[PDB]
Amino acid sequence: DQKQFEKIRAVFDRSGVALTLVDMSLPEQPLVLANPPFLRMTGYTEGQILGFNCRFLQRGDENAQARADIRDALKLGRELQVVLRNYRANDEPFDNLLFLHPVGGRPDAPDYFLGSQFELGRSGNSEEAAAAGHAGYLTGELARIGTVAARLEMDSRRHLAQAAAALVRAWERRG
Amino acid sequence: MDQKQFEKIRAVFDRSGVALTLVDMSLPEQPLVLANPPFLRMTGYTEGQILGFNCRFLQRGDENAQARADIRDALKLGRELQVVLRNYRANDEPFDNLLFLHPVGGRPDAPDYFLGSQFELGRSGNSEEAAAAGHAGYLTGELARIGTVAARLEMDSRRHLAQAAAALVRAWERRG
Ligand SMILES: Cc1cc2nc3c(=O)[nH]c(=O)nc-3n(C[C@H](O)[C@H](O)[C@H](O)COP(=O)(O)O)c2cc1C
Ligand SMILES: Cc1cc2nc3c(=O)[nH]c(=O)nc-3n(C[C@H](O)[C@H](O)[C@H](O)COP(=O)(O)O)c2cc1C
């Protein structure tokens, strides 16, 4: 459609978490939407990145296993949450808890894919809390875009919160 | 304060996944004006029974004195609170209730309504801290559509709330 994509651009602007949309009917898998808390999180500008692949937040090859899961989830049209080593436009390193969620299309061939980025080590004291809170918030945005139904939202919010914290517990566990 | 917002407060309440209530602050009795199905399902009531009543009906009297004082303070000041209350369902079954209060409408120290969101504790067979924080983050996004919070402070209030909620279950866990 086209009414839907416009509602998506709306949610993206007024959103309090980082949000990226990429087109899946294009082989490079390009960004068609990056939102202000994302641009401000990475340092880039909506024009110097829109049309490319969010791979650019990576240097070299630091995320072999995580990139494998990503490529499989994109192929399958499945949600994924995964920690990546990223780098801002000023090449300062940060860990990115990435949330992936298929948008539009058919269940095995979505039109777009949504990514939500949760920077680690920003918070006051609890990284589990901050990540779950991110997850909980993101669940609400996803419901707005109309990817999730208005019933499956009380479990989905807690699943995502559990998964996000379970991942944070792993991230810290690497001593 | 104004309207157009009240049609979308209803819109939010009806489809939301968290327990949500709204209390009219222009009356000193402070009655429920909206209770959504997750709140109804959690407490064992139907909607037509509780509209018009003050939410203290979920209590057993003389129990949450410290909490109730903080709640009265929040309501008077017109600012937010998060507390834990001993509550009971319509069949007298006890549950613990992490309650999020948030001012809506009006002027700074005289809101038109207060919103409540109830998180039942101990029903998460995994991580209570993460479950409570997931709720807070989801509530924060919910409060952003009703117009109270929006833009930059919609991001900071979410991360604040997620932090506060976890700290509360951490305390809750401490005292047994
Ligand atoms: C919607 C979406 C958002 C993404 N966000 C990020 C990101 O923030 N950081 C990152 O390193 N990779 C991100 N990726 C992953 C890359 O775009 C890429 O698909 C991934 O690295 C696997 O690709 P590869 O074939 O280059 O190994 C995102 C992917 C999608 C589809
Ligand atoms: C919006 C809103 C929601 C509330 N939800 C609850 C609740 O779920 N459980 C509860 O015990 N009290 C709840 N309360 C608080 C009671 O209505 C009352 O304010 C509290 O018991 C403290 O006041 P009191 O000492 O006069 O009873 C809520 C209050 C407001 C404004």
Ligand 1 atom nearest to A21, measured from its CA: 1
What string of H, E and C letters represents the secondary structure of A42-103?
HCCCHHHHECECHHHHCCCCCCHHHHHHHHHHHHHCCCEEEEEEEECCCCCEEEEEEEEEEE
Distance separating alpha carbons of residues A75 and A109, to the nearest angstrom: 8
**A91 conformational bin, left if phi > 0, alpha if psi -120 to 50, beta if neither:** left
A149 touches chain B (CB under 8 A): no
Length reported for chain B: 176
Number of domains in chain B: 1
**B122 conformational bin, left if phi > 0, alpha if psi -120 to 50, beta if neither:** left
Across A83-92, b (16+ Cβ under 10 Å) vs e yields bbebbeeeee
Length reported for chain A: 175
Phi, psi of B80 (to 5 degrees): -85, 155
Distance separating alpha carbons of residues B87 and A79, to the nearest angstrom: 37
Map residue B119 onto helix, strand or coil: strand
B36 and B20 Cβ atoms separated by less than 8 Å: yes
Within chain A, what is the greatest distance between any pair of CA atoms? 48
B1 and B25 Cβ atoms separated by less than 8 Å: no
Sign of the dihedral defined by the CA atoms of residues B157, B162, B165, B166, in that order: negative
B106 and B122 Cβ atoms separated by less than 8 Å: no
Map residue A129 onto helix, strand or coil: helix
B97 lines ligand 2 (CB under 6 A): yes
Pairing of strands B81-88, B32-35: unpaired
Q: Cα torsion for B121, B126, B130, B135, to the nearest 10°?
A: -50
Residue nearest to ligand 2 atom 7, measured at CA: B55
Name all residues whose Cβ lies below 6 A of ligand 1: A 20, 22, 29, 53-55, 57-58, 67, 70-71, 74, 84, 86, 96, 98, 100, 113-115, 117
Any idea what the CATH number is for the domain that residue A78 is in?
3.30.450.20
Rounded distance from Cα A61 to ligand 2 centre (Å)? 54
Pairing of strands A93-103, A80-87: antiparallel
The domain containing residue B52 runs over which residues?
1-176
B34 lines ligand 2 (CB under 6 A): no
- Method used for this model? X-ray
B102 and B143 Cβ atoms separated by less than 8 Å: yes
Map residue B153 onto helix, strand or coil: helix
Burial class (CB in 10 A: 0-12, 13-18, 19+), B56: middle
